[PDB]
Design a protein around this ligand. Structure first.
Ligand SMILES: [Cl-]
Ligand SMILES: [Cl-]
Ligand SMILES: [Cl-]
Ligand SMILES: [Cl-]
Ligand SMILES: [Cl-]
Ligand SMILES: [Cl-]
Ligand SMILES: [Mg+2]
Ligand SMILES: [Mg+2]
Ligand SMILES: [Mg+2]
Ligand SMILES: [Mg+2]
Ligand SMILES: [Mg+2]
Ligand SMILES: [Mg+2]
Ligand SMILES: [Mg+2]
Ligand SMILES: [Mg+2]
Ligand SMILES: [Mg+2]
Ligand SMILES: [Mg+2]
Ligand SMILES: [Mg+2]
Ligand SMILES: [Mg+2]
Ligand SMILES: [Mg+2]
Ligand SMILES: [Mg+2]
Ligand SMILES: [Mg+2]
Ligand SMILES: [Mg+2]
Ligand SMILES: [Mg+2]
Ligand SMILES: [Mg+2]
Ligand SMILES: [Mg+2]
Ligand SMILES: [Mg+2]
Ligand SMILES: [Mg+2]
Ligand SMILES: [Mg+2]
Ligand SMILES: [Mg+2]
Ligand SMILES: [Mg+2]
Lengths: 178, 178, 178, 178, 178, 178
């Protein structure tokens, strides 16, 4: 079953969502789910020797301003394999514009890693880690000649509100589309 | 096609079965196949810095007392990726109770690694390796507060008999269920 | 969707094809797509301590003389995961006979790694790298007692012509078959 | 120069010490510095499929009740190679008895990873992480038949006091010894 | 023996030098040789999720404007371990200022990897690879608040001339110093 | 201290020797100890996509017909780092001629991995594993144009006798040499 159309957004939306991981932490290959088929696809190789600082993917049954599912970043100690489902607790949101599109990204922790039990909001994350994530998104497209802008971070409530918006964007798109 | 409902238990049951691997040797992440969809899911992160000592997964079209497919452990030199099918020869069985449920696990070797050609029964395995596997299952849930009990090991015949039982448990469950 | 029947051979055949990777560079496990189901399967473990020198897989909706999809070798800096789709530019072809069957293999580079932007034909590849690939295929089955013969390399035009042949072999097989 | 006799305990003892790492996080091999020569030696392979949860090593020019240098555990995101020096800030201490010997171990963070800038005492560490470390030391020798006892954790002051003791134990031993 | 004072700069200076690697390609940890002792030391963890794109280290018995040995970058397919000696052929030089100091870095290939046999000058390197290296050095200190400037690349002759300068800087420093 | 001149051949020669590992299992880089300095050096990159099937190194204070220390192969489950000392039990010997020189290699197991407790002679090793090792040494230099010949395997007694010969070759060489 298609993990973008056929998985729900989460088991307890918006406090607990499913993250479908595309890119394990540590990868330079920018994988994306193929919308037509369900398979993992190489979108491109990053043009700089940078690596994704988080397990990176989508919330199923969401849509967003960049014409793709809403993006989620899960902090995993051991990275997962692509196309793994993680039950994830949103704790904040990175406010990014990407090539002119709103392209904000939920920051979340795995519900079922007790290391993160006390991580509940954006203030629980080491400041240098938030900075490292923002800096990656600030610079990783510089050699492609594409502009990104990072505004800062929102808290868990702002993240949850954005998840609800993205869920409605999917309904609107694929009530008529798929 | 669903690798739990749509793969057969094996090509020459019970002497050769299919193992659908969920967890590569060396992982601390406890992946499981999602029964509803077919996708890999993070069930939890082990609560201790322990790693699966075997490639760990299921026999398709089986069921078992813990309310999930029957568990199989494949000794792979190079671990496989999750959701890989391995043709596996049962050589023994670990007798485990897990949280009060019978939860025995086949020990098997890959048919198509010649390293293991002479591994045919539980006496062919290094004793310290059997001990390491049992000890993992004895201790890996201690910080979750869940009880496990390891009784010892059975031989290849006992493993094969248990495979036949698990195959019938699936028929009984999913002749009415799925 | 089945990535062998349900993916097209490519977006701009034969100059740009899809490669569906089975084996990441660096693996000793010989994975293959299961034709019946779509899942990754362990075909065998190489009998020697050799590793695939390329990301290795198939072109979807192709067939070939060895009774399987046409083989493609993609030069990836960071290997991909099995069952990843790569948009690939053919640059040459390895002329191999395998156990008596024609079993030539496209050599390609990822379109979306700028490292390879100037790799367009077989003369762009380091000679020692072509030699390493040929030598692997020359020797990797010696302990299985199976014969392989490597004739040399063809250029990108010869590769493209062979892709068109393999695409027609699939139509012929699965217009009546699947 | 010998990194046990010829490195000082630290640049600002006891608030900043040198950790000479023997074992990278994730290893099952229990490496130790060879006291006679300075080289890394395999002391043993852990008897269970457990891995060191921390970068593990010694403080130079220390001695301790188990007849070896005082042990230190450094929390590194990317593990270091054996025999690497890390400038480390003690934040707490694990109170362990090992085979009847006092064998407490400093817990420290790297001074020069900004991720850890706000980690200054034992209360800054996720509780589940302290539990995972203690559990490892509680169980990792069970198959060797050797007893360990973990009493709990002390704070950074208690750790610093123990570092000063271990430094004096070295002076006493190797004022007459080496 | 100290691999900075006791190794020569090379076997056929300046056409073939020794590179003493500190940092394997793919590392985020910035290791440096400890000048006082000879041991590997963690200088810092990069503040961004970037990795060294090359095997990175020093030419022995050199000195440079940043108060440390002259830097060399070796293109290794399989990264080496820290403190490994590589016989390296200079092919070009990255013109970098680092925090106000001249801090140029030789780009070299291993003499004894035949993959690189035809890499002899800066024009032999893929343009995107030179860009990736420069971009790393342009951005990797942005979160430390330290300025770097990359001027571009020089050819193999310019690299060789700079090696000869750095060799004389060591003689001048350590004819009086060490 | 130099781990070739300053380590003894073993603690209980010839039944237990020291192996000083140069090459971890899985490496394509052929590292060797530098005789002049003690440091690890890249001797060459293998010309084929083959990997060392064993942890590979030397017995200290030995010499041999190829003008270097006597070679030893240690079967490690988790490979060690270069320049690690392993206490090793010889179980057999590979009879190799390399470029015209006798170049036999001890096969050994780690004393302190209980997995190998019952491995005491060449008959204890899986036949396919001996074949894989021999095949590697048969083929790995084919692209260098250098001849190797593998005669077969000797048992543990023959290995032990060869260790005693190699120890005397060192005395003869470095009673006058070093
Ligand atoms: Cl992205
Ligand atoms: Cl389990
Ligand atoms: Cl193949
Ligand atoms: Cl320990
Ligand atoms: Cl640098
Ligand atoms: Cl060799
Ligand atoms: Mg995108
Ligand atoms: Mg996205
Ligand atoms: Mg975007
Ligand atoms: Mg997006
Ligand atoms: Mg379960
Ligand atoms: Mg299970
Ligand atoms: Mg269970
Ligand atoms: Mg179970
Ligand atoms: Mg095949
Ligand atoms: Mg094929
Ligand atoms: Mg073939
Ligand atoms: Mg084929
Ligand atoms: Mg000890
Ligand atoms: Mg210790
Ligand atoms: Mg101890
Ligand atoms: Mg101790
Ligand atoms: Mg520096
Ligand atoms: Mg430097
Ligand atoms: Mg600098
Ligand atoms: Mg510098
Ligand atoms: Mg040699
Ligand atoms: Mg040797
Ligand atoms: Mg040799
Ligand atoms: Mg030799």
């Amino acid at each position: 079953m298609n993990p973008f159309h056929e998985l729900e957004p989460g088991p307890e939306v918006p406090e607990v969502v499913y993250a479908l991981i595309e890119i394990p932490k540590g990868s330079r290959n920018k994988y994306e789910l193929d919308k037509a088929t369900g398979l993992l696809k190489l979108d491109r190789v990053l043009y700089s020797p940078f690596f994704y600082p988080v397990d990176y993917g989508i919330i199923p049954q969401t849509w967003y301003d960049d014409g793709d599912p809403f993006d989620i970043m899960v902090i995993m100690r051991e990275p997962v394999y692509p196309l793994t489902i993680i039950e994830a607790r949103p704790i904040g949101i990175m406010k990014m514009e990407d090539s002119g599109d709103k392209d904000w990204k939920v920051l979340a922790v795995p519900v079922e890693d007790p290391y993160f039990n006390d991580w509940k909001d954006i203030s629980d994350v080491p400041k240098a880690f938030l900075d490292e994530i923002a800096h990656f998104f600030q610079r990783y497209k510089e050699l492609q000649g594409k502009t990104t802008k990072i505004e800062g971070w929102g808290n868990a409530e702002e993240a949850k509100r954005e998840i609800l918006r993205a869920i409605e964007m999917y309904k609107e798109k694929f009530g008529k589309e798929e």
